[PDB]
Design a protein around this ligand. Structure first.
Ligand SMILES: O=C(O)C1=C[C@@H](OP(=O)(O)O)[C@@H](O)[C@H](O)C1
Ligand SMILES: O=C(O)C[NH2+]CP(=O)(O)O
Length: 427
């Protein structure tokens, strides 16, 4: 598709769609709890839809009526064998978290994904899961999808120290622990998004958090809840950047989740000297309105501890860095290579084809800033963030064109992206 270029101004209010991580979990917790669960303002991107259909395939009734999602919980030991293999689509969150969900399934199921998902390692989740008594295997020693999983009625509690800063592995193990008899202890390597921890408590469950050590007693019974999903910061991130780098711009992003384990981009924007104002803070829902204005930025260093707080924002931040004076280093971000695409190589190639000056490294990239961008053709390779990153970049192309192939990839997390972009070009 042809992307809009040489924008002269961006003004407007935007209510980004729901948080992907929380939406995924709302369905999982909704299915595992006893009673009814209603989810409001859920993200309807393809990844969340894949999660919902997976559970419907497992016998869970999930109705989407008049903008409200209603789930009829099945217990905690209530999922049933699916008629066909479970289609995880492009969702790594779905396959990894659900692998832990099915840890107690007394049947064998197959889980597959698209071309993108099929190249991603599941060993990080199969290894600990097998310690609990779950039988799981994929292709090659890295257990690439498709996977075959057979749970057990005799799940043993898990004692595992994560070797990587992954919230998905932590969450998969927590769902499994909820089904096992005994005390499980999960130790994070670095603090990662704590959405599973928050929601377990919201659905009546219990856990102990002592620093990076998470203790979960099993088995537990949960209760259906009313879940209101906040705007996804990862989605708002595209506009936070666009508002900072485009000329004569001021964007206001309302109802954006502000959980401390997800606000890495805010610290980066500050370090770089961007004009950011945070107002209308809701201390209970952890949401706020974020306002950005055209700014002159300076490069910064992005590493340790901060990575898991902005892991998904690195693609847009790289663009942000291309517009700052000086160098910006991103390291300790080896996890980028294993996402929907190798986001170190693809991001580097995409932006370099547009004005460049990004040097990819083994654990990240080094960007030398203040590049005037120009036209280019970019393929999404099935990664929604590459697409949206390129769209925002295109706005800065003064003269030339930008073709984005496989742009539908964006629908996995932000279907209404272009509608929002269009609403900002006139204001
Ligand atoms: O648990 C979650 O909801 C997520 C965890 C992250 O992956 P890792 O756990 O692999 O870092 C992130 O990239 C993904 O989009 C959402
Ligand atoms: O949303 C993102 O930026 C990365 N998601 C990875 P997944 O959810 O497929 O594991």
């Amino acid at each position: 598709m042809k992307l809009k270029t040489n924008i002269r101004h961006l003004h407007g209010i935007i209510r980004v769609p729901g948080d992907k991580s929380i939406s995924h979990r709302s369905i999982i917790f909704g299915s595992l709890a006893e009673g009814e669960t209603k989810v409001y303002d859920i993200l309807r991107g393809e990844d969340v839809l894949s999660t919902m259909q997976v559970f419907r395939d497992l016998g869970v009734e999930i109705e989407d009526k008049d903008g409200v999602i209603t789930v009829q919980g099945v217990g905690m030991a209530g999922l049933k064998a699916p008629q066909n293999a479970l289609n995880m689509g492009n969702s790594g969150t779905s396959i990894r978290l659900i692998s832990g969900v099915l840890a107690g399934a007394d049947f064998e199921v197959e889980m597959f994904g698209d071309d993108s998902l099929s190249k991603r390692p599941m060993d990080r989740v199969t290894l600990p899961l097998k310690k609990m008594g779950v039988s799981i295997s994929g292709q090659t020693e890295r257990d690439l999808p498709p996977l075959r999983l057979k749970g057990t009625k005799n799940l043993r509690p898990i004692h595992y120290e994560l070797p990587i800063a992954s919230a998905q592995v932590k969450s998969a193990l927590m769902f499994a622990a909820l089904q096992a008899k005994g005390e499980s202890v999960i130790i994070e390597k670095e603090y990662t998004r704590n959405h599973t921890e928050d929601m377990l408590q919201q659905f009546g469950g219990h856990l102990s958090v002592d620093g990076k050590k998470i203790t979960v007693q099993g088995p537990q019974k949960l209760t259906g809840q009313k879940v209101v999903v906040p705007g996804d910061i990862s989605s708002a991130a595209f506009w936070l950047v666009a508002g900072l780098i485009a000329p004569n711009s001021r964007l206001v992003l309302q109802n954006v989740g502000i959980n401390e384990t997800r606000t890495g981009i805010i610290d980066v924007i500050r370090a770089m000297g961007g004009k950011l104002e945070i107002t209308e803070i809701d201390p209970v829902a952890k949401s706020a309105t974020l306002i950005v204005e055209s700014s002159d930025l300076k490069g910064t260093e992005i590493c340790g501890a901060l990575i898991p707080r902005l892991i998904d924002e690195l693609p847009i931040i790289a663009l942000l860095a291309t517009q700052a004076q000086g160098v910006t280093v991103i390291k300790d971000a080896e996890e980028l290579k294993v996402k929907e695409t190798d986001r170190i190589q693809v991001v580097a190639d995409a932006l370099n084809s547009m004005g460049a000056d990004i040097t990819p490294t083994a654990d990240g990239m080094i960007i030398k800033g203040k590049s005037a961008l120009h036209g280019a053709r970019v393929n999404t390779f099935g990664d929604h963030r590459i697409g949206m990153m390129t769209a925002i970049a295109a706005l800065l192309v003064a003269d030339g064109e930008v073709e984005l192939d496989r742009a539908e990839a964006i629908n996995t997390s932000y279907p209404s992206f272009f509608d929002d972009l269009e609403s900002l070009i006139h204001g």
